[PDB]
From a paper:
In strong agreement with these findings, we have previously shown that in the Gram-positive bacterium Corynebacterium glutamicum the MksBEFG system (a Wadjet type I system) is indeed involved in plasmid copy number control. Unlike the classical condensin systems the Mks system from C. glutamicum contains a fourth subunit, MksG (cg3103). Our data reveal that MksG is a novel, divalent cation-dependent nuclease that effectively cleaves DNA in vitro in an ATP independent manner. Our data reveal that the plasmid defense mechanism by MksBEFG is executed by the MksG nuclease activity.
To get insights into the function of MksG we determined its structure by combining low resolution X-ray data at 4.6 Å resolution with high confidence Alphafold2 (AF2) models. MksG is formed by two domains, an N-terminal (N-ter) elongated domain formed of mostly α-helices as well as an elongated 3 stranded β-sheet, and a C-terminal (C-ter) domain with a central β-sheet, flanked by α-helices. The C-ter domain forms a dimer in the crystal by extending the central β-sheet. The N- and C-terminal domains are connected by a flexible hinge region. A structural homology search using DALI on the AF2 database revealed that the C-ter domain is homologous to the topoisomerase VI (Topo VIA) domain of the Rec12/Spo-11 meiotic recombination factor. Structural comparison of MksG with Topo VIA shows that the TOPRIM domain dimerizes, in the same way in both proteins, to form a DNA binding groove and allow for double-stranded DNA breaks. Sequence alignments and the structural superposition with the Topo VIA subunit of Methanocaldococcus jannaschii show a conserved position for the magnesium binding residues essential for activity. The N-terminal domain of MksG is positioned in a similar manner to the 5Y-CAP domain in Topo VIA with respect to the TOPRIM domain, but there is no tyrosine candidate in the equivalent 5Y-CAP domain that could have a catalytic role. The only tyrosine within reasonable distance for a putative catalytic role is Tyr258, located within the TOPRIM domain. A modelled DNA molecule could be placed into the putative binding cleft formed by the MksG dimer and the distance between the two active sites could be compatible with double stranded DNA breaks.
Numbering used by the authors:
A (entry chain B), B (entry chain A): 21 to 388
Write the structure that this text describes.
């Protein structure tokens, strides 16, 4: 089919957008589009559209013309445009009508001349839409990450002017690439940003309270400053954790559900006898399994078929129950979870156990 | 209009439900419903419906009948039912067809005979739908609240079997009424339940860290176990609070927004020089005002027209701005809030201040 000038314009702009990387590198191979001039029969079938096709190309210096003999259809020998060829990037950009976009791209590109041009061009998609101020901030941030490698600092501790956390996160992939470039690392550099926040809550009896503080929440990293505990009681439910009294030599730990598995990776938790009390449901047993995966001498409390049998009348159906296998449960815990399964996937929350009964069973287990 | 038997049944049941309190008290005044027998003309216009009306009442001992003379319409003297009268609660309940509901209501009511019958009947709406087990638990809970007045304990510390927090809350108004009854208090008793709310977060320099713990979160009640601070830096935004370094003799406190006003009620906060750093918006200044309402020597940091003037280019419009007057701001803070107002209700979040600049201004203010 005949390629009209509007169609060539569209294809040229589409190609320009498809090869933005190469053009910024000066790697323009040229674009050649055949215009497919009408056959004699088509020229005779629609004389006016064929005239329009030819007229749209007349007088262009980048267009090849050829004489076709249409004498059999009464038009005689007529010169028709056959092919557009754009050899230079300037010809493409002026033809594709993208001069302002190209100038803005080169201006932004030139602001990035401190980095490898090849890498910049390959990821043009990351920066073509940024403001010049955003680019200047980006350069400043890259220098900051090069001067403070593995800072371990929170995203907020990047003290670069105009750089707030939401902005730094939004362009993060670009920053990682540019840090990799300056470091000579492939792809994306580790920024060495931190997250901190590894926290755990502990309660003490007044005789053991560090500096007399009987209820503290600390980062896991500070646990080495404490006296080693003889007994740790980890409690999943917070309300049960808070209602318990405190005992000499016993550190009470809040398990915070599944967070228990990450918490027990701290050496503090292996230095004592670890007792765990969770929910009587799938999730409590899965947390117990994960805890023993790091501290195998973990003893369960109130997570036995005897307690289940007593308190199942307050159980509700666990709505999310999916049979999962746990490798680190003892037989009596497999028996208790199976017992919860068969009564209709029961969940017996810790809060349904009478606090005094839980205290009595805990005291029995702790005393040995 | 003639009242058919179905309509009387409906009205009797509706009345029964409307006076449930009085019936349980034996205060049944009787129900009298006039049946409005047809006039001669209506009896003649619809002979069959009139026959049905009469037939539905025939043979009932509680129905008054009267002879109407319908001879002018060819029916002669005909006896017609004129009025239903139910004098006893049994007649009403059997007629209203609510025997099972009435028996269940009295059984539940008899379970409440330990309390004033009048009060129980007046609030029948609170208990008619409970199970007998829920009633037994309620009695046990009432005895618990009578034996532990002003316990200050959390809802979870109610160690009554089968009573969990969600259940105790769902029936709470009923429990308060019953405790009031046994206490001889009008209406609803204070249960004397607590909320054990507090929680302030503190960071220390390593030389001041209690037992070497440099980042702790404690209940406000534990603050008396700490050494009195020389300087407190309260920070509203958490990310700024965490990114700051720690200084000798300086305790950094997390203000947690509006929670700062309740936190500073602790004597710990008056024992030192209290510095506050909040957001540059309406909320930060309102928190500062509330803080000084308890600790008048509170000094603001970075909440001045100089800092505003420098960082306003990162401000955004505060969308919830409502002109509020604050009594405890100093003139330079009124000037800074007014400056935020006039540039279009700006919010300049703490995270937009360069961390090193905030550190420098904080260090200047702390050093004096």
């Amino acid at each position: 089919m005949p390629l009209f000038i509007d169609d060539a314009l569209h294809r040229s702009k589409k190609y320009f957008h498809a090869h933005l990387s190469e053009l910024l590198l000066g790697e323009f191979a040229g674009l050649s589009l055949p215009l497919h001039p009408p056959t004699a029969a088509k020229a005779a079938a629609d004389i006016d559209a064929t005239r329009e096709f030819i007229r749209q190309w007349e007088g262009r210096d980048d267009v090849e013309y050829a004489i076709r003999n249409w004498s059999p259809v009464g038009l005689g020998k007529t010169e028709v445009p056959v092919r557009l060829t754009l050899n230079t990037t300037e010809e493409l950009v002026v033809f594709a009508q993208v001069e302002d976009e190209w100038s803005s791209l080169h201006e932004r590109f030139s602001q990035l001349s401190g980095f490898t041009a090849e890498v910049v061009a390959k990821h043009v998609s990351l920066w073509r839409s940024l403001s010049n101020d955003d680019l200047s901030k980006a350069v400043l941030v890259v220098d900051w990450f090069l001067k403070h490698p593995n800072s371990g600092l929170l995203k907020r501790a990047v003290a670069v002017e105009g750089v707030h956390t939401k902005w730094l996160e939004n362009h993060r992939v670009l920053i990682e690439t540019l840090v990799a470039d300056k470091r000579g690392e492939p792809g994306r550099a580790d920024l060495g940003l931190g997250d901190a926040e590894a926290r755990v809550r502990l309660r003490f009896h007044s005789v053991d309270a560090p500096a007399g503080l009987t209820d503290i929440e600390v980062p896991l990293s500070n646990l080495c400053e404490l006296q080693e505990p003889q007994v740790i009681l980890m409690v999943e439910n917070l309300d049960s954790f808070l209602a318990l009294p405190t005992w000499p030599g016993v550190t009470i730990a809040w398990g915070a559900g599944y967070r228990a598995v990450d918490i027990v990776r701290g050496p503090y938790f292996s230095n004592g006898r670890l007792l765990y009390w969770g929910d009587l449901d799938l999730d409590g047993f899965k947390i117990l399994d994960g805890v023993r995966s790091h501290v195998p001498h973990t003893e369960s409390v109130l997570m036995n078929s005897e307690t289940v049998s007593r308190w199942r009348y307050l159980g509700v159906a666990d709505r999310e129950f999916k049979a999962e296998s746990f490798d680190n449960l003892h037989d009596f815990e497999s028996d208790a979870l199976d017992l919860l399964i068969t009564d209709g996937e029961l969940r017996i929350e810790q809060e349904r156990i009478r606090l005094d009964v839980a205290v009595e069973e805990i005291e029995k287990v702790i005393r040995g």
